[PDB]
């Protein structure tokens, strides 16, 4: 006779709020209190109000909490290697970044949900663009990730989720640069990066998907 409340918790039931998404999914198109959860099964939009692939207490960070991060880069390289791999060695590609936080700051959103991604650094008309790359197919962008993009992107940014080659890749287009509030010091950034060993399989990743960089970069 310990029941009498466990009956009562399920407080709120929820199975109905799921919908379909067609793509080429540009994220404007948000629905408030929602996320997207990519399977096999389709492509779909389900709230965390009935989504119970959730994060079950755990938190993630702000667009403010990003922009902190990107301000301390030169601190954190080794925690950030996955993202400075995406230049490929370059330091145009790099000094570009340092005017552009939204950069950062969507990686690094993309990067506390979704540990196991690709990004790809490219750059036209004097403009950087990310294309970060989905390793599992078992693709799911929370709520929380999700809005924060949106107010780390606005204005300039027009953030696009696309599967090619039966892999999901979030591409993100810078269309204007507005200068930044904000400045790094590039020089202790750009020798840091050179003093950084280039694994051999992360190169060799690359060239994974030369078949497929390419035709993304295009824009
Ligand atoms: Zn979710």
Redesign the pocket.
Same mark, same amino acid.
């Not at 799911?140 to 709520?143: G, S």
């Given at each position: 006779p310990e029941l009498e409340l466990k009956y009562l918790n399920m407080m709120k039931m929820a199975i109905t709020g799921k919908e379909s998404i067609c793509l080429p999914f540009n994220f404007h198109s948000h629905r408030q209190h929602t *996320?997207?959860?990519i399977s096999p099964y389709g492509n779909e939009q389900?709230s965390?109000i009935a *989504?119970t692939? *959730?994060e079950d207490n755990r938190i993630l960070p702000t667009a403010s909490d990003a922009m902190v991060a990107f301000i301390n880069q030169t601190s954190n390289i080794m925690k950030n290697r996955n993202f400075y791999y995406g230049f490929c060695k370059s330091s145009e590609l790099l000094k570009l970044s340092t005017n552009q936080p939204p950069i950062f700051q969507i990686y690094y959103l993309l990067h506390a949900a979704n540990h196991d991604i690709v990004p790809f650094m490219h750059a036209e008309d004097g403009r950087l663009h990310m294309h970060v790359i989905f390793e599992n197919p078992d693709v799911?962008?929370? *709520?929380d990730c999700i809005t924060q993009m949106l107010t780390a992107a606005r204005e300039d940014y027009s953030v696009t989720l696309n599967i090619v080659r039966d892999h999901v890749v979030i591409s993100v287009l810078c269309h204007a640069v507005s200068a930044s509030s904000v400045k790094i010091d590039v020089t202790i950034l750009q020798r840091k990066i050179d003093e950084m060993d280039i694994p051999n399989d992360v190169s060799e990743s690359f060239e994974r998907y030369k078949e497929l960089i390419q035709e993304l970069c295009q824009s």
């Open positions: *996320c997207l959860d389900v965390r *989504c692939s *959730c799911h962008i929370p *709520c």
